Amino acid sequence: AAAAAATESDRIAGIFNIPAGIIPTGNVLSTIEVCAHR
């Protein structure tokens, strides 16, 4: 559905210095970080 307006959410994102063209509305899969010290 919509909950708070998606257009309004994207506008609020834009006005507060974030130039996010598309705010994700769904499943997001990021990459786990593996840090090695040699």
């Binding site: 786990i32 970080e33 593996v34 840090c35 090695a36 010290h37 040699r38």
Partner: protein, 50 residues
């Protein structure tokens, strides 16, 4: 001499050898429990962190 007529002997009947039933790791239950990840170079690793 009847001693010229001798036939006592014994023979081998054959033998069988045991083969080892091999285990392929990914085909046991524990396979999905573990994520096995290739990285041969680890001797030069001091301390890794996630």
């Amino acid at each position: 001499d009847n001693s010229l007529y001798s036939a006592q002997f014994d023979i081998l009947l054959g033998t069988y050898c045991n083969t080892l039933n091999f285990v392929r790791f990914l085909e046991l239950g524990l396979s999905v429990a573990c994520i096995c990840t290739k990285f041969p170079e680890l001797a030069y690793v001091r301390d890794g962190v996630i």
